[PDB]
Enzyme design. Sequence first.
Site, mmCIF file in Angstrom:
data_model
loop_
_atom_site.group_PDB
_atom_site.id
_atom_site.type_symbol
_atom_site.label_atom_id
_atom_site.label_comp_id
_atom_site.label_asym_id
_atom_site.label_seq_id
_atom_site.Cartn_x
_atom_site.Cartn_y
_atom_site.Cartn_z
ATOM 1 N N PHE A 163 -7.959 14.264 -2.378
ATOM 2 C CA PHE A 163 -6.945 14.495 -1.368
ATOM 3 C C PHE A 163 -7.582 14.965 -0.059
ATOM 4 C CE2 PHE A 163 -3.799 17.522 0.493
ATOM 5 C CZ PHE A 163 -2.839 16.591 0.825
ATOM 6 N N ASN A 173 0.847 -1.200 0.000
ATOM 7 C CA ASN A 173 0.000 0.000 0.000
ATOM 8 C C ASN A 173 0.877 1.242 0.000
ATOM 9 O OD1 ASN A 173 -2.117 1.879 0.440
ATOM 10 N ND2 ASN A 173 -2.138 1.513 2.625
ATOM 11 N N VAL A 174 0.915 1.946 -1.152
ATOM 12 C CA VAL A 174 1.729 3.182 -1.305
ATOM 13 C C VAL A 174 0.878 4.261 -1.965
ATOM 14 C CG1 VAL A 174 3.831 4.228 -2.195
ATOM 15 C CG2 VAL A 174 3.766 1.787 -1.618
ATOM 16 N N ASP A 205 -8.233 -4.097 5.189
ATOM 17 C CA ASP A 205 -7.262 -3.430 6.089
ATOM 18 C C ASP A 205 -7.850 -2.154 6.697
ATOM 19 O OD1 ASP A 205 -5.168 -5.356 5.713
ATOM 20 O OD2 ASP A 205 -4.496 -4.312 3.858
#
EC number: 2.7.11.1
Length: 289
Positions: free
Chosen positions: A95, A32-33, A142
């Site tokens: 964002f 996960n990035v 997650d």
Amino acid sequence: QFREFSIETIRNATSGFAAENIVSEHGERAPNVVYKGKLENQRRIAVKRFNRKSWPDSRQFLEEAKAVGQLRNHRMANLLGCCYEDEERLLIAEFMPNETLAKHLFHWESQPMKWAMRLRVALHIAQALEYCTSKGRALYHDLNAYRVLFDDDANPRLSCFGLMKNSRDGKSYSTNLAFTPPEYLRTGRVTPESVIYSFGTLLLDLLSGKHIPPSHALDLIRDRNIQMLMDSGLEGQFSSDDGTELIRLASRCLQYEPRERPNPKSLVSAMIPLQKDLEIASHQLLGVP
């Protein structure tokens, strides 16, 4: 509306996937990035960059992304688009400029998160899960404090990225098995009920200010041990009855038997009577500008 982006567009927006644009928690080499970027229309975005070989079939990646892209709700950081050029597999989302629950909860500087704010997070994330389930995306991967993000108004939102697996085979999950539902090791699959278990772990995080494995939270929860379980930073902010009610809810979510766990609507109904300071803006409660 959900759209496709070129890889050149996304490299431009992220300054070539510059390491210091990473906003996720595991660095550059992880399943996960996520990178912050800015498009030419001046919209700020979050870009999840999947690993090589994770989603090798572009068609199936695109179809999952499109499916998630149909969801639009104010409790989510919503999915704006995707990129599947040149072996890359990217998701582009709204964002969230006020960072993560993990930051405010575990890495506070001025003061611990207020009780009323913790309860607001729990309610709004439950509502997000209810929304996702209503639109046919009942699985979330997650779920933890790094997937809870705060928007421009400091309102908590659920990251859309967790609605898709890190890899098509489901073997690139980040959650330590100490925090996974008991049936997950046996089956290797997320179900709606296992999401509820993960919500339980989030409740434990919120109640304690710590990331406590559920097995450890076990006798503490049984004894409703407020001194041990509850965050000292909350002392004075809640009645024993209300603290105990949230503990009981966490207990329900963490039941071994999946069928005994609450459904998303029950999470919401359990959370509503406990809310405090509803009239106070999140900016004020969270303590951000």
